[PDB]
Paper text:
[name] (TIM) is an enzyme that is only active in its dimeric form and that has been found in almost all organisms that participate in glycolysis. During the fifth glycolysis step, TIM catalyzes the reversible isomerization of dihydroxyacetone phosphate (DHAP) to d-glyceraldehyde 3-phosphate (GAP). TIM is essential for maximum energy production. [name] is a protozoan parasite that causes cryptosporidiosis.
Here, we present the 1.55 Å crystal structure of the apo form of TIM from [name] Iowa II as part of a structure-based drug-discovery effort. CrpaA.01119.a.A1/TIM crystallized with two monomers in the asymmetric unit. Interface analysis using PISA confirmed that this was the native dimer. The fold of CrpaA.01119.a.A1/TIM is the typical TIM-barrel fold consisting of a barrel of eight β-strands surrounded by helices. The two monomers are very similar: 249 Cα atoms can be superimposed with an r.m.s.d. of 0.2 Å. In CrpaA.01119.a.A1/TIM the active-site loop extends from residues Pro168 to Ala178 and is in the open conformation. While the ‘open’ conformation is typical of apo structures, a blob of extra electron density is observed in proximity to the active site of the CrpaA.01119.a.A1/TIM structure. An unidentified blob of electron density occupies the location of phosphate moieties of ligands in other TIM structures. However, phosphate or sulfate from the crystallization buffer can only partially explain the extra density. As the identity of the ligand could not be fully established, we deposited the structure with UNK atoms in the active site.
Residue numbers in the entry:
A (entry chain A), B (entry chain B): 2 to 250
């Protein structure tokens, strides 16, 4: 059976003081049957590693929120896979909705980043999802197919991939996603991955839910047959992120 | 008379070990009449601060290679001015040629970033410059005017601004800029700032040269009347960056 994956995307948040307090809480988490990652900002990755230190259970690992399309060189403002590996970071998000929406990350850029990450041995959390206009006009499945076809173009091996479904339509719009709707989207993603690859590959692929996750709804969502964990937003900046990890046990 | 400014842009380069060695050299620099900044990647800022420690000569300060357009929040992959201030970083590059060229930073995004940086108390190194096609078609001045007009739109106070002129036409093209050509571009920039503001403001504004700078040419360039220091690329990842600082004495 698939090992569950619980990620905490800090986004553009954190201070030295707030992260010190938060990581002190996370060090109290004694064990997990799931993979557990937190994704601080690039500015905070080394600090967060220092805060964890060695006096912890080895439940939490650290990931990046983004990776450069290129390796080292004349890429002002960018951070490369090789730099991350030097820092002992073995995972990154790619194609988060916010980067697609705000920073001109196209499907083709996302493909480039997935390939770059996987080639450098990183675990890549590929983010996909449709907007409210797309959902309301019946294009959910068209969008998921396009995003997968393009993001995974010439990507042969999914062993180090995880897919996060972001119900963009249900984030900040006043519209709310039910667990049933989440499950339906995850089942469809898995079904398309079967077509693009095969049933063995799709059966092994973790598909994590990247909508609104809190301590109040995580236990219901994780039971859904095609939901294999979470990519958590704001709830990952609170000690009760531990309750979300516990739901995945 | 203007205080000179020597910046070292590391771009997307560095490892823990290589930076440890480099900063150990930079700590040997005993004094400078110039402002001195190094701009590591965001991943490396806290480690570079560690390596300098708390008993060095106080010659070097640390800057960022980029800042977010927005403050904290749901901006995956971005690092904000407020985050930089929390880490005691007081300076950033904005509008570097590589970000304009590769990451879709328009003049309007650059304006947004200059305003956001300055409003948060950061010293902003605004980068401008024209391409080889622009230079060869006679558009150098048109391009500089446009870039300044847009980047400084509604920017009233230039006390925390520095401008870096990047002769993009002379970087990676096989075409080489002479110090005379650099001087001519710097003089034009200052002349246009006079028109946009006034001669007091333009006489106080540092305009630093962001073309090819090494220990072999820095002494000739710094003597130029309108060249007030440097934004150095690859030469800033070597101990001999110290020789470039020394040219600005
Ligand atoms: Na499940
Ligand atoms: Na000069």
């Amino acid at each position: 059976s698939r090992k569950y994956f619980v990620g905490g995307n800090f986004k553009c948040n954190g201070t030295k003081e707030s992260l010190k307090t938060l990581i002190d809480s996370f060090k109290q988490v004694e064990s997990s049957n799931s993979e557990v990652y937190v994704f601080p900002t690039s500015l905070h990755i080394s600090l967060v590693k220092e805060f964890f230190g060695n006096d912890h259970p080895g439940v939490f690992k650290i990931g990046s929120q983004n990776i450069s399309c290129t390796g080292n060189g004349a890429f002002t403002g960018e951070v490369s896979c090789e730099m991350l590996k030097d820092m002992d970071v073995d995972c990154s998000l790619v194609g988060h909705s916010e980067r697609r929406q705000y920073y001109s990350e196209t499907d083709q850029i996302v493909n480039n980043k997935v390939k770059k990450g996987l080639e450098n041995g990183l675990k890549i959390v590929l983010c996909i999802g449709e907007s409210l206009s797309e959902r309301e006009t019946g294009k959910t499945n068209d969008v998921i197919q396009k995003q997968l076809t393009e993001a995974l173009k010439d990507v042969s091996d999914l062993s180090n991939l995880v897919i996060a479904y972001e119900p963009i339509w249900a984030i900040g719009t006043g519209v709310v996603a039910t667990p049933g709707q989440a499950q339906e989207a995850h089942a469809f993603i898995r079904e398309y991955v079967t077509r693009m690859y095969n049933p063995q590959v799709s059966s092994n692929l973790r598909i994590i839910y990247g909508g609104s996750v809190t301590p109040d709804n995580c236990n219901e969502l994780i039971k859904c047959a095609d939901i294999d964990g979470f990519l958590v937003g704001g709830a990952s900046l609170k000690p009760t992120f531990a309750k979300i990890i516990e739901s995945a046990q």
